[PDB]
């Protein structure tokens, strides 16, 4: 709740700012994924 990013291998709720570039927290790998939105999406069920 207020989360911004997640690294790929383990899944740590990171959320650092520009003038920080990349990197995890005690897991390193400069990979990183953008979490999800909270505009909880609606499906045609067809």
């Amino acid at each position: 709740a207020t989360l911004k990013y997640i690294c790929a291998e383990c899944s740590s709720k990171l959320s650092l700012s520009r003038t920080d570039a990349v990197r995890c927290k005690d897991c390193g790998h400069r990979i990183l994924l953008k979490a999800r939105t909270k505009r909880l999406v609606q499906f045609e069920a067809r």
């Binding site: 999800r36 909880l40 999406v41 609606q42 499906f43 045609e44 069920a45 067809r46």
Partner: protein, 266 residues
């Protein structure tokens, strides 16, 4: 008993094997079509996804959820959401369901449709119950989960028909045969030697009579007798499919009649 003549010989909770006597082929037919195609039902038709960490994509499950058999027994007293005066849905037009499960163990955790949960008010009607024929007791099989994967959904089941999507079909497979030997010669049987030794005698060849070589071709004869059988998915019990079939056929025959009455006006 004054016209069209049914007689069951075998019947279960998903099988109605019966002869249907004394009818126009053109009708028998239009019955089977409107059966498959036009009997109303309830099935999930809008999925709001909270979280989904499954190996399966969103729209996939959504689809899977569609097909799940949901009780439609009392369905003919729930309103079409296109009709109901509410903005989007309500309990007057829709049942709402909730699904969550979550990876708990090491061993693969299943998500049955038994894990489905009504939320909205049924106002005491018989509707929206995921149907289970399963002996073990587990409806269908939505999805599967490893150690740490949630799934948070919100199903809005709505009234609808097969003509809109085969999810709304109640019917499955309908058996249909008339005139087991070719006495009406409505077909011309392919062969290499004996037409008879080569094709198979349909089980429906005892309740009719053999032709007898001597007799010439009976021409002015037409189609009576149709050896049908109705299977059911089981939103509706078998009897009500055929009933409501005859019903909806009648209702949409009936509405033409009304439409002619509405046009004398101007």
């Amino acid at each position: 008993e004054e016209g069209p003549q049914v007689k069951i010989r075998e019947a279960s909770k998903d099988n109605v094997d019966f002869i249907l006597s004394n009818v126009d082929l053109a009708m028998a037919n239009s019955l089977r079509r409107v059966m498959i195609a036009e009997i109303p039902t309830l099935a999930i038709d809008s999925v709001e996804v909270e979280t989904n960490t499954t190996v399966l994509a969103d729209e996939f499950i959504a689809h899977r959820l569609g097909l799940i058999p949901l009780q439609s027994m009392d369905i003919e007293q729930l309103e079409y959401s296109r009709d109901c005066f509410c903005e989007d849905h309500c309990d007057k037009c829709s049942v709402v369901l909730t699904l969550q499960a979550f990876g708990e163990s090491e061993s693969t955790t299943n998500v049955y449709s038994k894990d489905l949960v009504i939320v909205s008010n049924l106002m005491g009607r018989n509707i929206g119950h995921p149907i289970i024929q399963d002996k073990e007791g587990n409806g269908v099989l939505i999805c599967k989960l490893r150690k740490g994967q949630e799934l948070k959904l919100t199903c809005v089941a709505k009234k609808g028909i097969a003509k809109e999507h085969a999810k709304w079909g109640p019917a499955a497979a309908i058996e249909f045969e008339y005139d087991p030997w070719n006495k009406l010669k409505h077909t011309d049987y392919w062969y290499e030697q004996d037409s008879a030794k080569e094709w198979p005698q349909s089980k429906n060849c005892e309740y009719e009579d053999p032709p007898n070589e001597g007799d010439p071709f009976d021409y002015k004869a037409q189609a009576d007798t149709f050896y049908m059988n109705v299977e059911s998915v089981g939103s509706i019990p078998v009897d009500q499919v055929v009933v409501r079939g005859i019903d909806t056929l009648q209702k949409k025959v009936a509405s033409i009649l009304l439409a002619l009455t509405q046009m004398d006006q101007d």
